[PDB]
Design a protein around this nucleic acid. Structure first.
Ligand SMILES: C[C@@H]1C[C@@H]([C@H](O)CC2CC(=O)NC(=O)C2)C(=O)[C@@H](C)C1
Lengths: 204, 144, 125
RNA sequence: AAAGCGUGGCCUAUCGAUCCUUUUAAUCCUGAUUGUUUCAGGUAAGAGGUGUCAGAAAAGUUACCACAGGGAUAACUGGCUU
RNA sequence: GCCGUUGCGACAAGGUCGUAACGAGUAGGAAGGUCGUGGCGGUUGCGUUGAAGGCUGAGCGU
RNA sequence: CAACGUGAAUGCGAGGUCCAAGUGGGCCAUUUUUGGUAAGCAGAACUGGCGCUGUGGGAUGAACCAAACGUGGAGUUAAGGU
RNA sequence: ACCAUCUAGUAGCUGGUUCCUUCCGAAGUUUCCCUCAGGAUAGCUGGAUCUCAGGCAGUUAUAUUCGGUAAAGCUAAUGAUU
RNA sequence: ACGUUUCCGACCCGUCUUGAAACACGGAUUGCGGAGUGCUUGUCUACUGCGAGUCAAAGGGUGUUAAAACCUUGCGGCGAAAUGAAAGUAAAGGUCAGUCUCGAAUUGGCCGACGUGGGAUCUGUGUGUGCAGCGCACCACGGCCCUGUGCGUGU
RNA sequence: GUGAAAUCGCUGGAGUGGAACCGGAGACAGUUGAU
RNA sequence: UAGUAACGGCGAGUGAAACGGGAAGAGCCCAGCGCCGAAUCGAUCAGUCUUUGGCUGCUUCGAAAUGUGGCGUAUAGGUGUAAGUUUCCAGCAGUGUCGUAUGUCCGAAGUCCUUACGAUUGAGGCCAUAAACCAGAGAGGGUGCGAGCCCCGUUCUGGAUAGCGGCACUGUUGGUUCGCUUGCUCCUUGGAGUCGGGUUGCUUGAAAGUGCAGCCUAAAGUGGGUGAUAAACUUCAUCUAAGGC
């Protein structure tokens, strides 16, 4: 029996909720277990990076996020070709391949091609047989500085830069921004009606 | 803090502060927000007008990311300019504010603008925002 | 901004502004005059701007020594009725000529906007 | 002719929410892959009715009966009345 | 005369004191409780020359 | 803008906001009053009470008369009495 | 039928509801409800306090008004009626 | 002082009830146990920190008196903007002077969060009191601005 | 281990006319204090 | 995200997902088409080994052309060609390197004086300025309540030893490797009583049908599905169902 000015109740507790209860008392235990798993994996695959495969750069899908980039699943075959890396070779040297993604824009393709290039620059390849090196394998003293990498491979930078102050140009001021926006909206909204009118005029 | 609750001071009084006539009794008026149209009608109408009924178009699977459009007023634009950029903005050079990177999509024209003209880059502008910026001497630049 | 307006009045230039409310910084204020303020707490931005503009900030114990009787003071306070809770106080929302804010779970066409709020559904107060 | 009078009946009764349906209105808004036309959905004003009239959708019997209560309430005594 | 509440006041004080008026109470609401009970983080001490518990004289507190 | 200056008695500090309990069976009495032959019956109006309340008196009594209550003392009384 | 479980089934109904002092202190009334042993609503009540430092009052006076009850009338209308 | 004896007073508690000592119900006695809780979500109030911000989640890094503590967020929650069913649109005027096609026009300066009344306090000045000035919070009466909608124009 | 209350038996004292308990005020018995 | 979109005698109530930040991250195999075409496989027999199972065959039988195997699957694939580039599995023995909730063994210092007690671990004292002694051990338990120092234990990011493991390198044994990448060239490329549709019932937040199923109907091949309001006609976008790890 609510009395007076109250917000109407909404609590979803009319089911037998006592049969489905989940607590979080094992949160620090899970943290410790995951740290130990990472340590074991690092020991297992040393000196390879603990994170694993190298991931690609990606624009966030929708216009709410399209000004931000993030790590993708892998590198498209177009990017691998642009960087001159075979898919088979990439799987061996630890680069993620996204067989579903395709590039439709030069800028997006080029960003990932450059990422692959810098990864190859930073790569250290051990000889397949320690006794006998080959072509492509890293040099002896290079193989001494090898160290296991922790965290993301080639982590992304999220710092925001500010455009340098400049002069306000006259042509910039003479533009009618609101009129332009409303004109674009109107043109899109009435595009079809004008086409219908044009077709009728042609038929007459 | 059980020590500060009413139960501590109600020990020894038979009814526990609920009366000898009415008595505390389970659900004397119904459970939840029941009876909002019959015997809780006065309360519902007095405190929650507009509750019953339905109004407006109904959108199957609304897309909130499309209507997402955070806004900033012209009066707050200068505070977005960092001090270093203000220092560099000398000799007629106006600071350039890219509202999209700061998280604002539309610029609204509430308040007054500072003396320094500003170049503002945003996806949408209101008419008053454009007029005030241009009157202050800056320019509005449309970005995608 | 309220401090600046108080000091920019004829005769208040050299008076000490006394407030027991927190002095916050205003992003919409562009120019800060010279302010002498005695307050309990001043936020970092407001303190920086006041001190940069050549002002002075003292505590209430220091005011007790500067002006034991409160001479040359300008007493100020924040808006007491400018709270979100206050918007819900007053005549009930469903009363004629009432502009009280109701306690609604959310905001939208589905949240207390149909019957008793528009003449299309029963009535409107 | 005018001053004036007229938003129903000289005055005091003669009547109806939400949801749904239906009609009238805009050279209206939406159907979210782009458009056109149907179709459907909206915004505003009416009608279809709740007479238990602030508005559940509703026939009996129990002496085979049951439960929570009631001296707030009947049948016997007592009390006031006659 | 004393106790307390309320109002007012003095005093370098979460206190003391002064002063005037006042003090019914079910349902109910607040306040104070160096009233009582069991833990925890700290602090103060007592104990086989006798703790807790139990029975019961001298007192203290409305 | 200029001038005028508080215009019956008595008493007394005034106003504002918020949060919330219990209650939503009442009963009695002077006076007025409806139904009833009446009722310690049923139903109303003003006020005061009992409920929630002890105390002196009416031998006794929820309501009648006096008078309302911290804890003690002296004096004097109310209604009632010797 | 019996046994275990759903199940601590629901109850506007009955019973109980555990320390002390201090201060304040009610209601059985309005409206709506398949409402009449119940709720919501206003009233009555407590607490927190905040803004101030003369306009108020269960009382009078002055001035001005409202009413159709007691009384009166029927040799004044209506209705009885010797 | 829970002994005796005198004088005065003295009906059995809890409960429902208008009304209980009741010929109303529970109570033979004693010990121990025994009833407004937990959590989610609201709202107000009090206190604390910071304040146009605040809190940061999952997570990560480190920590061996290691379930703690400490560090760590282009991003998330709430707040900073409302209003419409929606398409959408989205909160700066006051004053002074002009031109005028004298209008539902236009221009330019100055000021910039509006006007008036009441306002603790503060300031000046007379004589506990008065007058004058700036006025916080708040109240009263207005004015403008955004949005929806009816009427209604034009430039 | 401790060993409560209810209930019960003994010894001594005291009361004892159809309840017993209880509040106020003394007296007695008794207890206790007195540089 | 979010108690949101939506559902609901639109009442009581119910109620997701994508985007975003993270944990972890790993990819692949068929049918069909085409090529080789039985190149494949089970038992049994005989040798041989490191034999609770493996390797060799003119062993003998059988499965398999109604098709076992090899290449090959949407990122396609294949032919030829030019460049580059080219092993991999499994055991055995050693050499070290490292973990073990794996057993066993090992450990610093007072039962010192006085006193108290039924019994001490209680109380006081033990050179020294800083002092009984040990302390990387003052966790816990036992012992006549009280104990680092009486005992087991505790600390030694403890030692020794035997066993199990994980690695890394050496040797060895058996099998296996005409391949892989990029350019050009020509050829080639796919699941049916299924999809879809009607209706019925259940189910969902899913709203002219979200998922599932019965019955009727029943496909196509740049076809098919999907783009959340049904239908035609149009712009496109995105995947590739009815097989598997
Ligand atoms: C206008 C009137 C009423 C209307 C309808 O029955 C009323 C609704 C009311 C409601 O909220 N829920 C219902 O299930 C019924 C209707 O079709 C006719 C009888 C006529």
């Amino acid at each position: 029996a609510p009395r007076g000015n109250q917000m109407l109740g909404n609590a979803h507790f009319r089911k037998h909720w006592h049969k489905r209860i989940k607590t979080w008392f094992d949160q620090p235990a899970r943290k410790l277990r995951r740290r130990q798993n990472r340590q074991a994996k690092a020991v297992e695959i040393a000196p390879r990076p603990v994170a694993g495969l190298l991931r690609s750069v990606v624009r966030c899908p929708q216009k709410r996020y399209n000004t931000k980039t993030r790590l993708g699943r892998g590198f498209s075959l177009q990017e691998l070709k642009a960087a001159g890396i075979s898919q088979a070779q990439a799987r061996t040297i630890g680069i993620a391949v996204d067989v579903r993604r395709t590039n439709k824009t030069a800028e997006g393709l080029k960003a990932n091609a450059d990422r692959l290039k810098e990864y190859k620059a930073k790569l250290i390849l051990f000889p397949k047989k320690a006794s006998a090196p080959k072509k492509g394998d890293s040099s002896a003293e290079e193989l001494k500085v090898a160290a296991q990498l922790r965290g993301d491979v080639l982590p992304l930078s999220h710092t925001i830069t500010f455009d340098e102050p400049r002069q306000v140009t006259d042509a910039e001021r003479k533009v009618e921004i609101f009129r332009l926006l409303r004109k674009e909206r109107a043109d899109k909204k009435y595009r079809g009606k004008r086409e219908k009118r044009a077709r009728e005029a042609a038929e007459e | 803090a059980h020590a500060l609750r009413k139960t501590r001071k109600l020990r020894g009084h038979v009814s526990h502060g609920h009366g000898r006539i009415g008595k505390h009794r389970k659900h004397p008026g119904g459970r939840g927000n029941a009876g909002g149209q019959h015997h809780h009608r006065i309360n519902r109408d007095k405190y929650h007008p507009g509750y019953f009924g339905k109004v407006g178009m109904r959108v199957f699977h609304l897309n909130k990311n499309q209507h997402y459009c955070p806004t900033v007023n012209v009066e707050r634009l200068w505070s977005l300019v960092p001090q270093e950029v203000r220092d560099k903005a000398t000799g007629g050079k106006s600071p350039v504010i890219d509202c999209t990177k700061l998280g604002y999509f539309k610029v609204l024209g509430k308040g007054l603008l500072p003396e320094t003209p500003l170049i503002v880059k945003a996806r949408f502008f209101s008419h008053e925002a454009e007029q005030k910026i241009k009157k202050a001497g800056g320019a509005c630049v449309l970005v995608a | 901004a309220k401090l600046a307006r108080a000091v920019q009045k004829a005769g208040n230039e050299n008076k000490t502004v006394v407030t027991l409310s927190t002095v916050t910084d205003d992003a919409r204020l562009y120019t800060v005059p010279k302010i002498s303020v005695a307050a309990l707490h001043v936020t970092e931005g407001a303190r920086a701007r006041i001190l940069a503009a050549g002002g002075e900030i003292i505590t209430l114990d220091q005011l007790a020594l500067k002006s034991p009787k409160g001479e040359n003071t300008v007493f100020l306070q924040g808006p007491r009725s400018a709270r979100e809770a206050e918007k819900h106080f007053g005549p009930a929302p469903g009363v004629p000529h009432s502009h009280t804010k109701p306690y609604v779970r959310s905001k939208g066409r589905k949240f207390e906007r149909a019957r008793g709020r528009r003449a299309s559904r029963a009535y409107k107060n």
